[PDB]
Each structure stands twice: as C-alpha cells, then as structure tokens.
Amino acid sequence: GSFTMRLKELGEFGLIDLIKKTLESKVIGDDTAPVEYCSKKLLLTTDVLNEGVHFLRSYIPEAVGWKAISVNVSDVIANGGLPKWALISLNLPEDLEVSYVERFYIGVKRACEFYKCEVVGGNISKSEKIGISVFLVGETERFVGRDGARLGDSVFVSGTLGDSRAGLELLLMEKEEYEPFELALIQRHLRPTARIDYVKHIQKYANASMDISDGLVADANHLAQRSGVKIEILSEKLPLSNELKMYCEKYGKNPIEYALFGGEDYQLLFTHPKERWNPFLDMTEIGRVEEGEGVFVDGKKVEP
Amino acid sequence: QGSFTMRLKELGEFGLIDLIKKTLESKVIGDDTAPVEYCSKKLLLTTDVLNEGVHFLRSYIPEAVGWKAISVNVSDVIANGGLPKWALISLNLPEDLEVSYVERFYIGVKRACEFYKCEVVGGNISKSEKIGISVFLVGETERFVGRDGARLGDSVFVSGTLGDSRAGLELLLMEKEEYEPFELALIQRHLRPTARIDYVKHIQKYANASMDISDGLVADANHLAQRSGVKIEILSEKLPLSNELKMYCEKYGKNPIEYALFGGEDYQLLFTHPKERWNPFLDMTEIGRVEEGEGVFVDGKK
Ligand SMILES: Nc1ncnc2c1ncn2[C@@H]1O[C@H](COP(=O)(O)OP(=O)(O)OP(=O)(O)O)[C@@H](O)[C@H]1O
Ligand SMILES: Nc1ncnc2c1ncn2[C@@H]1O[C@H](COP(=O)(O)OP(=O)(O)OP(=O)(O)O)[C@@H](O)[C@H]1O
Ligand SMILES: [Mg+2]
Ligand SMILES: [Mg+2]
Ligand SMILES: [Mg+2]
Ligand SMILES: [Mg+2]
Ligand SMILES: [Mg+2]
Ligand SMILES: [Mg+2]
Ligand SMILES: [Mg+2]
Ligand SMILES: [Mg+2]
C-alpha cells in the first residue's frame, strides 16, 4: 500500500464538517438550507436513492417515485416549510425498461400532486446501477432549524417509530407470503408519507425541528448538539404502533429498541413548551430539554 | 417467455425526456433551465452531472473538477439570461477515496463560487462504487430567454471560439508527461471551462433564443432550430477558431472545422437576434441566420 487518510476514516459527518470549513459556510447544518429572498426564506435541500442501498430494481417503481419526492419534502416540512419546485437527476443503465422510468414518474407525479409541488426539470446520465438525486425548493415565513431548542422545552415526535426498520427486515426475509400486519410495515418502509400536515404547527410554535431519517437516538444527538443542550427521553413514552408490537412478539424482538434505533421513519422531532401542544395532531411528548450535553434515555446515556 | 419491452438504449436520451415531460404533463421542461415565476421575477432552476469514467477521471486535478462542476451549471443559467444565486452539491463517494481529493474538489468549488458570485449552501453525501457529482443550481432573472424565441431573419451568434475543449480532451488522453504551452491552454479550456457570465446582460436584454454549446455546435443548433420552429443555416468559414486550436490541428493533422462543428464541452453561448443588436464590446461572432423551415445547414448541405 502507501497510507493516506480515507473517507471511511473521517466519517460522513467529519467529512461534512470539513466541507463546511473549506467552504467557510454558515447555512450548512440543518435538513434544509434557508436563503433570504423577498421577505421570505426559500428552503433548498437534496437527498438520494441508490440501487443496492435504498431500494432494488425489483421494487415497484411508482412506490420508489413516491418515496423519492416524499423523503425530500420531509426535510422541508421539518424546517417549517412547504415544497414548491423540484428537479430530478437520474443515473440510468441503457438496459433498464422504459416502462420502469415511466412508472417511477407516475409515482413522482402522484406525490407532487399530494404535497402540492411540481417537478420542473432534471437530468439524465448513463450508468451501471440506478441513481436518483432529488433537489427540492420550498418556502417558509419562518425557518425552524436544529439549534433553537430552549431549556425546559418538551420533546415531541409524530406518529409511531420503528415501523420502517421492521418493514425493511421483513422485506429481507423474502418470504413467499406475509400476514396483513407485515404488509402494513413493509408498506411503511417502501412508501413513507412526509408529515406535511405539521407544517403550520412547526412553522408557528417549534423552537427546534428536524425529521427522523437515521433513527431517534442518532437524530436527537444532532439536535442536542446544534442547540447546545441536553435531552432526556423516556422509553415507555415512545409511540409504538400495533403492527410493530405484533412484529416484535412474533420474532422475539424488543419494541423499544426499534423505536430508538430503527431508521427511515420520516416522522418529526421538535421541541417547545408543552403548552404549544396541539392534540389534533398525533404528536407525543417523549422527553424534555435540560442544560448540559448529550442525549439520555431513562437516565442512561447513549450515542450513534 | 421473453422480453420484447423497450429499453432505454433504444429510446435514447431525448426520447426519454419527451416521455417524462408527457408523463408529468410539464410545460416548462425543455430548456437549459426551468424558469419559475416568483416574487415578480423569474427563478431559474437547473442541474448537471459529472460522473467518474464518463466526464472526468479520478486522476484529474480535483480542484479543476470542482471548478468545472460549478461552471457547467452556471453556464446553463447564463444561457437563459440569469445570474447564479445558490447551489447544492450531491456527492456519490467511494469510502476508499482520499479525503484530500474531496477537500481539493471543494477548494475549486469555492473559487468558482467567488468568481461567479454564487454560493454552495448545502448538499448530500452517499456511498457508491465510483465518484458521482450532481449539482443543483438556482439563479434569478428579470427576463427568461429559452430556445424557442428565435425569429426569422435573426442572425446566429456564438461566444469565444469552438472546438478547443475537444482538442483539450484528446491531448489529455495522450497521457504525455509534458505538454507545450499551447497544448496546456487547450487542456485548460476542457478541464476548467469558464461560464460566459459576462454575457448575462446582453442575453437578458437582446436575445430571442439562447443556450450554451455543450454537445457541440451542430447538435445543439438542432435543439434550437426545432425548438423554435425554424431552420438555422451556418457558414463554416465564419466559425471562430483559436490560434491554439489551429495550432493543434496542424501539428496533429486535423481539420479545425470539424472540431468547431462537432467538438463538445466548450460551453460558449449560441443565441439569435437581429444583426443590429450586436455589441462589438463582446466577443460574439455571427455564424449564420434564422430562415424559415426546419433543420440545420452548413454551407448548403445538412
Ligand atoms: N430526469 C428528468 N426529469 C425531468 N426533466 C428532465 C430530466 N432530465 C432532463 N430533463 C430536462 O430535459 C431538458 C434538457 O436536458 P439536458 O440536460 O439535455 O439540457 P442541458 O442541461 O441543456 O444539456 P447539456 O447538459 O448538454 O447542456 C431540460 O429541461 C432538463 O431539465
Ligand atoms: N456534499 C455536501 N456539500 C455541502 N454540504 C453538504 C453536503 N452533504 C451534506 N451537506 C450538508 O450537511 C448537512 C447534513 O446533511 P444530511 O444529509 O445529514 O441532511 P439530513 O437532513 O440529515 O438528511 P437525512 O434526513 O437523509 O439524514 C446539511 O446541511 C446538508 O446540506
Ligand atoms: Mg433530515
Ligand atoms: Mg441526506
Ligand atoms: Mg433527508
Ligand atoms: Mg442520513
Ligand atoms: Mg445547456
Ligand atoms: Mg444536462
Ligand atoms: Mg447543461
Ligand atoms: Mg448533453
């Protein structure tokens, strides 16, 4: 060999840190990048779906299109904004079926119609495997990032956590037949829906907000860090779906571990005083913001 | 049973784009950028990609690839009459890659951004076999200029010179240990293209049709011709040639004319308007005219 520092040694976030320093950037750090424009703040963000990593060519295309758009809107919603325009960059092999690309865009069209945004352009490049890069532009009257959490705030999450991971694992079992609750979980993993119904709430009362893409514990660490505060979470407060409970029962798994470390749930994690709570939304208080460092669960500390 | 279903290779890049447009029932898709009405002005959205093994090699100076990544997207915005504001960079990276490669890439990206007065405000990092670079750029303009506004009688122009980038790449592929100064100037135009940000005002105020030359003059003229519903006629003898290019062709026995017509990645502008709107204080050259009909002609033939 020869020896020279490689990316695998720096870590995804150490690399981002370096990119930030080199660029001498100030906006880099949240789910979206807020820019000043016409008294409002436009929100720019991007996410990727790669074959062999986020999906397989065997997955139903329309669902992949839906997910592509959903995942980006999720970031925009999390920062208190509404999706407006999007571009889709595609890396495609010449052997892929035309109908695959067409069905994918039908799903894209469906999601855009649902979140009320629109794909206005994109790109095409030939490659080995399929690569999907989505760029989304949203807008808000008030940008809500990850460093505004206040001491005393309560910690909330939307819907249930852990579903996506169980669904993924079920997909991996490649079973010949799944029970209904299994199909529900699988569906939650394959076709997530961005919590666009929280936009007004987030844009109005949240001090800090972000979507949960990598898992509660891991994403809360990012939040606690930018806010320069501590966060106490209580296991028995974590919202668990019935299907998740049914899955853990059947496969001898612990529901709590899935709620804490399961990823790609695309729910929200935000903080504010308990009084701002809106019971019309399926939000659940799961912790609080104290002074200090790190993320704690039932008194014990844990990290990524 | 077997498969008799159409695959991409057979449909082609543009045939695929047409399907996507039809499927999305889109009206904006079609130009170098996507103009969207916002706050009384027009925001321009565009994206381009640079993949390892296709557009560049891991052995190319990283900072140059970083400069080019921003430049080709800014060139698109420039072609439709706008100025770059913000950009996102989505990176597909091999975990085995040297961290310095990534840092150097962003150094060139940084330089490009300070030069074109735009800013990279975010992006993405993903694991992959080969390096994949996808940049999203957002510009603004007080007047969008697509590829359909070409009027009859209009004169056809181009900026700078043509065919340099192709000589540059051919030189690069020779993997020589050393190059002559004129050869380096050529390699330079291929590796570090400079977007014609100096033509913004002109394009925004007096162009009927506009776009940048990315795939080559003839190839890109066609997109302009059919998109406007006219036929563009060009005179090869009026094509702008550089000394270094003519220099390269003589030394290697090449036809500099073919390079100006089919050479790609020059990133110069191709626009139309009446001869009268010509600004002598810019390096534009008249290469032909917009006449009624269809298709592209050069010295009579097509
Ligand atoms: N996957 C896609 N989805 C939606 N629109 C697309 C997609 N791919 C390309 N387009 C649109 O097709 C049109 C032409 O794209 P293309 O990349 O060829 O233009 P360009 O960027 O001008 O080309 P070059 O990069 O050679 O200049 C543009 O409007 C582009 O946004
Ligand atoms: N290649 C890059 N260049 C510049 N900034 C980047 C790049 N990649 C990521 N960033 C920025 O680093 C910060 C974190 O990126 P990251 O992908 O973690 O966003 P995210 O919201 O966590 O997405 P996800 O929900 O999928 O985890 C963001 O501000 C992002 O824009
Ligand atoms: Mg996120
Ligand atoms: Mg991301
Ligand atoms: Mg995300
Ligand atoms: Mg992530
Ligand atoms: Mg172009
Ligand atoms: Mg392109
Ligand atoms: Mg382009
Ligand atoms: Mg092209």
Topology, please?
The structure is a homodimer.
Chain A: H1 7-10, H2 12-23, E1 33-37, E2 40-50, H3 61-78, E3 82-92, H4 98-115, E4 118-126, E5 131-140, E6 154-158, H5 163-172, H6 180-190, H7 199-205, E7 208-212, H8 216-227, E8 230-233, H9 242-250, H10 255-261, E9 267-272, E10 283-290, E11 295-297, E12 300-301
Parallel strand pairs in A: 3-4, 8-11
Antiparallel strand pairs in A: 1-2, 2-5, 3-5, 6-9, 6-10, 7-9, 8-10, 11-12
Helix pairs in contact in A: 3-4, 5-6, 6-9
Q: Mind explaining what this structure looks like?
A:
Chain A: InterPro entries: PurM-like_C_sf, PurM-like_N, PurM-like_N_sf, ThiL-like. Chain A: Mg(2+) 1 binds at residues 46-47, 123. Chain A: Mg(2+) 2 binds at residues 47, 75. Chain A: Substrate binds at residues 54, 264. Chain A: Its EC number is 2.7.4.16. The PDB classes it as transferase. The structure is a homodimer. Chain A is of the alpha+beta class. The first copy, chain A, has two domains: 1-144, PurM-like, N-terminal domain (60s Ribosomal Protein L30, Chain: A, 2-Layer Sandwich); 145-304, PurM-like C-terminal domain (Phosphoribosyl-aminoimidazole Synthetase, Chain A, domain 2, Alpha-Beta Complex), CATH 3.90.650. Chain A has helices spanning 7-10, 12-23, 61-78, 98-115, 163-172, 180-190, 199-205, 216-227, 242-250, 255-261; strands at residues 33-37, 40-50, 82-92, 118-126, 131-140, 154-158, 208-212, 230-233, 267-272, 283-290, 295-297, 300-301. In chain A, the strands form two sheets. The first copy, chain A, has a seven-stranded mixed β-sheet. Chain A has a five-stranded mixed β-sheet with strand order 1-2-5-3-4, with helices on one face. In chain A, helix 5 (163-172) packs across helix 6 (180-190) and helix 6 crosses helix 9 (242-250). Bound molecules: adenosine-5'-triphosphate (ATP) (2 copies) and magnesium ion (8 copies). One magnesium ion (MG) is lined by residues 213-214 of chain A.
